[PDB]
mmCIF file of C-alpha atoms and ligand atoms in Angstrom:
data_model
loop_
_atom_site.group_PDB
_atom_site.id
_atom_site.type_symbol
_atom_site.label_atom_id
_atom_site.label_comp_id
_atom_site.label_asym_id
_atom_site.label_seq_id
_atom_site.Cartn_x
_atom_site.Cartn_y
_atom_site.Cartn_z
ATOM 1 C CA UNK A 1 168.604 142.678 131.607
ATOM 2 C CA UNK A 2 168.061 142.317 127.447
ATOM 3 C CA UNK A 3 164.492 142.726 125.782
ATOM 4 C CA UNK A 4 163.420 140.004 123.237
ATOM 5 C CA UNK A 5 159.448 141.136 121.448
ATOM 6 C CA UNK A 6 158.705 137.868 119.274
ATOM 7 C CA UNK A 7 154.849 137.405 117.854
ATOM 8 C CA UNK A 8 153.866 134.251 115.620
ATOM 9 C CA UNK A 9 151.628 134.726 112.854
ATOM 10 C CA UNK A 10 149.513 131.868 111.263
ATOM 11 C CA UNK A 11 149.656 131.543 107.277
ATOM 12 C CA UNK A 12 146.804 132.123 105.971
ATOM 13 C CA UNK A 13 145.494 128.242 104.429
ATOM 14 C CA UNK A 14 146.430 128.759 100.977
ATOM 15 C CA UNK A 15 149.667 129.736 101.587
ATOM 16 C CA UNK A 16 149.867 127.602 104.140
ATOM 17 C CA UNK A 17 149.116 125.312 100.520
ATOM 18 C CA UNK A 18 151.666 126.554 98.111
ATOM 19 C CA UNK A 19 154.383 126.812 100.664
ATOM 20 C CA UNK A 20 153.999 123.342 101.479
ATOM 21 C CA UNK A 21 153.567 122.720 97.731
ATOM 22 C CA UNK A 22 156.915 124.693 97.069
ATOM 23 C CA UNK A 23 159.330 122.754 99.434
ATOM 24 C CA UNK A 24 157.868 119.339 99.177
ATOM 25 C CA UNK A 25 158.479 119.234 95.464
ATOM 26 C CA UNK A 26 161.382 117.661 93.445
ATOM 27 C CA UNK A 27 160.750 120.079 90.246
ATOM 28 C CA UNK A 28 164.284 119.475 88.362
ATOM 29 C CA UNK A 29 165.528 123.525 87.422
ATOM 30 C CA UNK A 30 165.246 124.801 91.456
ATOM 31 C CA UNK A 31 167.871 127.666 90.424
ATOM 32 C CA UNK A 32 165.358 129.986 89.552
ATOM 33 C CA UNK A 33 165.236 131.029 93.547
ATOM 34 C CA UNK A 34 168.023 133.160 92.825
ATOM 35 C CA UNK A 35 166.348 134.845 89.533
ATOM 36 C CA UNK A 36 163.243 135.544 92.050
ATOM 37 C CA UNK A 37 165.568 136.635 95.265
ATOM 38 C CA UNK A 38 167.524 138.944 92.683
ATOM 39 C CA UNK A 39 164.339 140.315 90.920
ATOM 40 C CA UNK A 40 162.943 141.322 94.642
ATOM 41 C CA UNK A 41 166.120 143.420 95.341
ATOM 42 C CA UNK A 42 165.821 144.869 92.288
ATOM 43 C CA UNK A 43 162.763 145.946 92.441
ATOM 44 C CA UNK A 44 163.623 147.035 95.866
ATOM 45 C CA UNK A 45 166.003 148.940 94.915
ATOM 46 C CA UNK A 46 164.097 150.310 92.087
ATOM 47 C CA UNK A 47 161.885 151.694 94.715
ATOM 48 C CA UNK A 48 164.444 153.151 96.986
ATOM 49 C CA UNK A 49 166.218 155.068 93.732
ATOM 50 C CA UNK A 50 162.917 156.361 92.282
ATOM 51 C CA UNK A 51 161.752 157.485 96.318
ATOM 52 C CA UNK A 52 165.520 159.370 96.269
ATOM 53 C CA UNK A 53 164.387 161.495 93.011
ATOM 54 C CA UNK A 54 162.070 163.787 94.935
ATOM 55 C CA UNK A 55 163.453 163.315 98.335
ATOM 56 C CA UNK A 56 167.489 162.414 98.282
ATOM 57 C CA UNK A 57 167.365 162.463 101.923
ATOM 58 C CA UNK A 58 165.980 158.942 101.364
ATOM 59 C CA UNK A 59 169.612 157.973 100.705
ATOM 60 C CA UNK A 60 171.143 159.346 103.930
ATOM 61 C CA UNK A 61 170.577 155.716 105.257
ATOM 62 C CA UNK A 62 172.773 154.427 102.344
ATOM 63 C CA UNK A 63 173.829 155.983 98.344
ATOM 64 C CA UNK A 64 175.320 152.466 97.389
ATOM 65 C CA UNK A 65 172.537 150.539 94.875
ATOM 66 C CA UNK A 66 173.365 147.047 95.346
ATOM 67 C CA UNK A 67 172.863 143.464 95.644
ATOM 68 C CA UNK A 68 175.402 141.363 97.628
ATOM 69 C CA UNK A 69 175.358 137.268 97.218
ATOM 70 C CA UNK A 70 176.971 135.728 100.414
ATOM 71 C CA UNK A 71 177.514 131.953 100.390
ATOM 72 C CA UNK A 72 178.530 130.057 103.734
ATOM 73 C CA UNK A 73 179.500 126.241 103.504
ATOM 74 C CA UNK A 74 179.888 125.964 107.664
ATOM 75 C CA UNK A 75 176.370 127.498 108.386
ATOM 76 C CA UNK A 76 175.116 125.993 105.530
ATOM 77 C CA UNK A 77 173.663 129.667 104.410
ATOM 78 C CA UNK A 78 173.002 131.503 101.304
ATOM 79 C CA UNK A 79 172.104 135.389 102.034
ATOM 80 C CA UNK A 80 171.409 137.766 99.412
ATOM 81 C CA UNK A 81 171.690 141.148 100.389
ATOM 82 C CA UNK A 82 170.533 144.256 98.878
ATOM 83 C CA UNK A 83 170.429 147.950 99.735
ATOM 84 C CA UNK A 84 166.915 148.727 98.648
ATOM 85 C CA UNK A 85 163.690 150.295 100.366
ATOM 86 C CA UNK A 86 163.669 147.962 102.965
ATOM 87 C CA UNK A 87 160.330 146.422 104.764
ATOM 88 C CA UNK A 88 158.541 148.416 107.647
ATOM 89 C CA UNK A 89 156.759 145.958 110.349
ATOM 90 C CA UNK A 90 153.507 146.413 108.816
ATOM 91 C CA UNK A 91 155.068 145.152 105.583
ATOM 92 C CA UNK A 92 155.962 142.451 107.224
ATOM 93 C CA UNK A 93 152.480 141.413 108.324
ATOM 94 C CA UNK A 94 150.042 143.068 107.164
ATOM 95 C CA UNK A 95 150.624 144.076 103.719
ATOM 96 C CA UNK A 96 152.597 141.295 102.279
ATOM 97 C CA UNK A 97 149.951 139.400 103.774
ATOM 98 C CA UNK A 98 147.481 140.974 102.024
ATOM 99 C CA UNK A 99 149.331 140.437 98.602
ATOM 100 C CA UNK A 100 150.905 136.886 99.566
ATOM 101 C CA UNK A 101 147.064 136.295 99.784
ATOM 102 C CA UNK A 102 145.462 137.215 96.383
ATOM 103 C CA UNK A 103 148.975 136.380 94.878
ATOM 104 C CA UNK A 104 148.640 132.829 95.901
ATOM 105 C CA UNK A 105 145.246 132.501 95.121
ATOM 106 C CA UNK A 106 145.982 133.716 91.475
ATOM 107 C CA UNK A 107 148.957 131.397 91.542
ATOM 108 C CA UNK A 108 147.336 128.439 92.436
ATOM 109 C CA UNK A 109 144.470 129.099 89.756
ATOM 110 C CA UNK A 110 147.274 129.197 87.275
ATOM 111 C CA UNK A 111 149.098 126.232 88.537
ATOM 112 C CA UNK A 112 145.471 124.129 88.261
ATOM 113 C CA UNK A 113 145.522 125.027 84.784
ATOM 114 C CA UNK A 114 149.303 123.894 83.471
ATOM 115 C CA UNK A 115 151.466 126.804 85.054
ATOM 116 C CA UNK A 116 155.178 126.249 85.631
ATOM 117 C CA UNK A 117 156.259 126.953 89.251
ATOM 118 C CA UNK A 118 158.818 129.551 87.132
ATOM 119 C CA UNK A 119 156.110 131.514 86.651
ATOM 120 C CA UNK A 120 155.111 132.475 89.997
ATOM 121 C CA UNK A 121 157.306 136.021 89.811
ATOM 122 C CA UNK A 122 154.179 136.967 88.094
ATOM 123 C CA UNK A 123 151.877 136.375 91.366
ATOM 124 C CA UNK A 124 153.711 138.700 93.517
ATOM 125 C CA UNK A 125 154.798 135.641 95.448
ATOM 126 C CA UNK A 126 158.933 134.491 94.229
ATOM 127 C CA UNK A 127 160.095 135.458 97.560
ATOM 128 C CA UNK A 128 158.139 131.757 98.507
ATOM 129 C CA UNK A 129 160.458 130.198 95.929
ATOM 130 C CA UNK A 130 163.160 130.020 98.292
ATOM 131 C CA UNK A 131 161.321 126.835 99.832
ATOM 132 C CA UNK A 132 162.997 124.984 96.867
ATOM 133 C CA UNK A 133 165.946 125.011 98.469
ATOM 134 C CA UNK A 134 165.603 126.264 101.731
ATOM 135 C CA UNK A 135 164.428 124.228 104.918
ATOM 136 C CA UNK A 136 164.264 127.443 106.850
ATOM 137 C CA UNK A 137 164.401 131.531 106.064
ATOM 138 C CA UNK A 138 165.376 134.346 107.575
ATOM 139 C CA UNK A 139 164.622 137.898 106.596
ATOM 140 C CA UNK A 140 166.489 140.694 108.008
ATOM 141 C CA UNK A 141 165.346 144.069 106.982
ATOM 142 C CA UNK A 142 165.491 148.197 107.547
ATOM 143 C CA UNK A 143 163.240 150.697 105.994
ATOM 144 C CA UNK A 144 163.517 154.566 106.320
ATOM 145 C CA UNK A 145 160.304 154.944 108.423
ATOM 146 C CA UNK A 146 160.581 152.017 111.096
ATOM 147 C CA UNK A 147 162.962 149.542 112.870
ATOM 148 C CA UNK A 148 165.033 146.829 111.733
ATOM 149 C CA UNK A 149 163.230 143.301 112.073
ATOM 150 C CA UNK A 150 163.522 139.879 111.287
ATOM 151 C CA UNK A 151 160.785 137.587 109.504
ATOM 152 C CA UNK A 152 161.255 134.085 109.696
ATOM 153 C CA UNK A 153 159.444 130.731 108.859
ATOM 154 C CA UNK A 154 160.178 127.088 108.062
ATOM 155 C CA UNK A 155 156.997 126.715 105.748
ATOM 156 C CA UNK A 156 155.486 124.781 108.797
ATOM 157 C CA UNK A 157 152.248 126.856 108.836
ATOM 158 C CA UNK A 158 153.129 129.772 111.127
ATOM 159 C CA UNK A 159 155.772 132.568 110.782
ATOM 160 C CA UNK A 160 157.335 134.798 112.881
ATOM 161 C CA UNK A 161 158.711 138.683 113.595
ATOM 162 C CA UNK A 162 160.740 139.822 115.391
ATOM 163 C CA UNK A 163 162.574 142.989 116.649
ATOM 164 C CA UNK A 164 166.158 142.032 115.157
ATOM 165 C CA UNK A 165 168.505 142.817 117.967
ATOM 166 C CA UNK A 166 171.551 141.218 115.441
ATOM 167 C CA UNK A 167 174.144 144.192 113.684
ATOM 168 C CA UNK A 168 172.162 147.445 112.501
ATOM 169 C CA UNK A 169 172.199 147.799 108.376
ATOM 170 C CA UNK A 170 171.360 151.475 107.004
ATOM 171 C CA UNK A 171 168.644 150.041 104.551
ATOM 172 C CA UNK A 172 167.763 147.535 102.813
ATOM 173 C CA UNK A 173 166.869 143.636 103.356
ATOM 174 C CA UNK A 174 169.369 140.509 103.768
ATOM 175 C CA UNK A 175 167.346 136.896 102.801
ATOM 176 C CA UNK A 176 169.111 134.220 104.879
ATOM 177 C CA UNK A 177 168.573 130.868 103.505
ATOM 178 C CA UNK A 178 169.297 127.976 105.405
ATOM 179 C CA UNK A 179 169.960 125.296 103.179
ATOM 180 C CA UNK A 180 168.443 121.686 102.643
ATOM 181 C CA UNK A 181 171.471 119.044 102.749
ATOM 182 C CA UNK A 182 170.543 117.955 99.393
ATOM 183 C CA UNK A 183 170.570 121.965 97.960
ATOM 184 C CA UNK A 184 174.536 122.390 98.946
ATOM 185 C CA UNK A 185 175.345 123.018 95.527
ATOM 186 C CA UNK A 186 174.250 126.893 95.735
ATOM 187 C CA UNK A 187 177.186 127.278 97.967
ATOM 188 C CA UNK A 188 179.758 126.451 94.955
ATOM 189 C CA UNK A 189 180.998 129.787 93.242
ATOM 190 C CA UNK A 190 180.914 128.251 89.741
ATOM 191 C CA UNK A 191 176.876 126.946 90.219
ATOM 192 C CA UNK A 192 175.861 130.931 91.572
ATOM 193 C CA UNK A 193 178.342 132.412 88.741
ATOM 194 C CA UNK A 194 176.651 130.452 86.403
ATOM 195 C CA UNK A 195 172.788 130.987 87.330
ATOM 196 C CA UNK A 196 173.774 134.917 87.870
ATOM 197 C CA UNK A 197 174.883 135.257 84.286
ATOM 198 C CA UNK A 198 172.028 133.243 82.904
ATOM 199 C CA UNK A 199 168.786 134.647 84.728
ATOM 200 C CA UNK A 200 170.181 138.044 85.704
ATOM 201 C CA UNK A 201 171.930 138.927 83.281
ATOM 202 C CA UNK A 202 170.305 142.609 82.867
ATOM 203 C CA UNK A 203 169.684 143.336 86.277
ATOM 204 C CA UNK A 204 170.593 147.361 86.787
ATOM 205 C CA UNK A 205 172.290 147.196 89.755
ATOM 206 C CA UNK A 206 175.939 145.895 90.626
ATOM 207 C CA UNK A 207 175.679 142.003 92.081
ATOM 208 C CA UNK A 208 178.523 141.055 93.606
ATOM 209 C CA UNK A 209 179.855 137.182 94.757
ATOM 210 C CA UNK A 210 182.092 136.524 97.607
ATOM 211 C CA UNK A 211 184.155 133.677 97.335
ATOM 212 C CA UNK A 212 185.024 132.194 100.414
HETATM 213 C C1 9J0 B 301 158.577 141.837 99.127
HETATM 214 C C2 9J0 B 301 159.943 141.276 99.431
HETATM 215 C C3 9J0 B 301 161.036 142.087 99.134
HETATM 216 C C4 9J0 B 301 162.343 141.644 99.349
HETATM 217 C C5 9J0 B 301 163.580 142.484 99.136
HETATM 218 N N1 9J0 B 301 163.434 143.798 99.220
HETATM 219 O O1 9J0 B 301 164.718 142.010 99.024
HETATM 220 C C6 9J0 B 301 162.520 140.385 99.894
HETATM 221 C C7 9J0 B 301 161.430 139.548 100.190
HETATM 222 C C8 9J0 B 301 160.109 139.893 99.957
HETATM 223 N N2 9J0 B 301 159.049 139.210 100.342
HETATM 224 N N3 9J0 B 301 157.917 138.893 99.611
HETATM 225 C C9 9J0 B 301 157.036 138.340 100.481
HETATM 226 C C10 9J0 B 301 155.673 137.827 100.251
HETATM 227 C C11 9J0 B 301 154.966 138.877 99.359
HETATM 228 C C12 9J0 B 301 155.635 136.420 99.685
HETATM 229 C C13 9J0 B 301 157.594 138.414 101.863
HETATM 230 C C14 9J0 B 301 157.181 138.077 103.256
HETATM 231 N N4 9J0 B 301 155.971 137.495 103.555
HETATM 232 C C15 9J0 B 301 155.678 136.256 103.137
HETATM 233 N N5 9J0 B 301 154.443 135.963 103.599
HETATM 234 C C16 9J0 B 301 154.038 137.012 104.284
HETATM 235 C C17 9J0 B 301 152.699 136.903 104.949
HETATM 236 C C18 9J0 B 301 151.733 135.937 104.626
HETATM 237 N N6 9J0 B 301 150.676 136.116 105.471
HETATM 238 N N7 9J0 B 301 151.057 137.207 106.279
HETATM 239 C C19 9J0 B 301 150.060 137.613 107.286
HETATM 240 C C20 9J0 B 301 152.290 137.682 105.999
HETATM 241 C C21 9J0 B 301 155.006 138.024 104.327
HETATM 242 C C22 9J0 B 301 158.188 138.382 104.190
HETATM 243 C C23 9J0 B 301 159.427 138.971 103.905
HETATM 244 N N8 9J0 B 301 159.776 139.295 102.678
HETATM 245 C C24 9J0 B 301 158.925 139.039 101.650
#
């Protein structure tokens, strides 16, 4: 016999809000999910790199600094993958919560008075920019001090986590997203080539497309 250990969370309202706000809307320059995804494993990675200064036994899960981009036409996926810090359960939960929270609420506040959605990198909050184009997300990720999980929600109000039985990475978080039928296009090559070179540009670490 196998061992499943699944809780579901309730968004807070507000996010509840935004994320229903975010994948409802038909705001024309969506792309910009892949600027946010790729500024969250940099920053990730960041993290991990400046962590490895003082203790370079941080890096005995992993020494490769990168950010993979993963497109799949038959599942309809789009994972970026990076080998950065990683999330810990209470990450997950609790203290993302806690920042998803007064993020939003700054967010919306902005958005009231004439803010772009763009802008929401600023808020703490871009990873919620995948509802552009995403009916559905999955977040796989392993950090140093804890277990490998997966995060998941379809911006229906509730999330859940998960202990990720799936194959063990060494560190670092994959962002599944499960496309809308009418977002297909971030599965072409020269449309994620093309938004790469012109919102991440400067990123520090190596991204690298595979082509199917
Ligand atoms: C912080 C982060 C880093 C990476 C990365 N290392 O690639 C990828 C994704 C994310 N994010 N960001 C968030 C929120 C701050 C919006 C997040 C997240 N999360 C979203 N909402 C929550 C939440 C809201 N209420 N509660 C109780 C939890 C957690 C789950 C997984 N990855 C996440």
């Amino acid at each position: 016999m196998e061992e499943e250990e699944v809780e579901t969370f309730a968004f807070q309202a507000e996010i509840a809000q935004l994320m229903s706000l975010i994948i409802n809307t038909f705001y024309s320059n969506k792309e910009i999910f892949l600027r946010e995804l790729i500024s969250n494993s940099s920053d990730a990675l960041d993290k991990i790199r400046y962590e490895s200064l003082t203790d370079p036994s941080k890096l005995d899960s992993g020494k490769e600094l990168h950010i993979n981009l993963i497109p799949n036409k038959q599942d309809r996926t789009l994972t970026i993958v990076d080998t950065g810090i990683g999330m810990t359960k209470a990450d997950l939960i609790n203290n993302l919560g806690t920042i998803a929270k007064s993020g939003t609420k700054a967010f919306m506040e902005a958005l009231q008075a004439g803010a772009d959605i763009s802008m929401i990198g600023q808020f703490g909050v871009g990873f919620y920019s995948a509802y552009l184009v995403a009916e559905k997300v999955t977040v796989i990720t392993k950090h140093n001090d804890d277990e490998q999980y997966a995060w998941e929600s379809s911006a229906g109000g509730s999330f859940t986590v998960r202990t990720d039985t799936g194959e063990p990475m060494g560190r670092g978080t994959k962002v599944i997203l499960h496309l809308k039928e009418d977002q297909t296009e971030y599965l072409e090559e020269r449309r994620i080539k093309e938004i790469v070179k012109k919102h991440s540009q400067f990123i520090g670490y190596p991204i690298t497309l595979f082509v199917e």
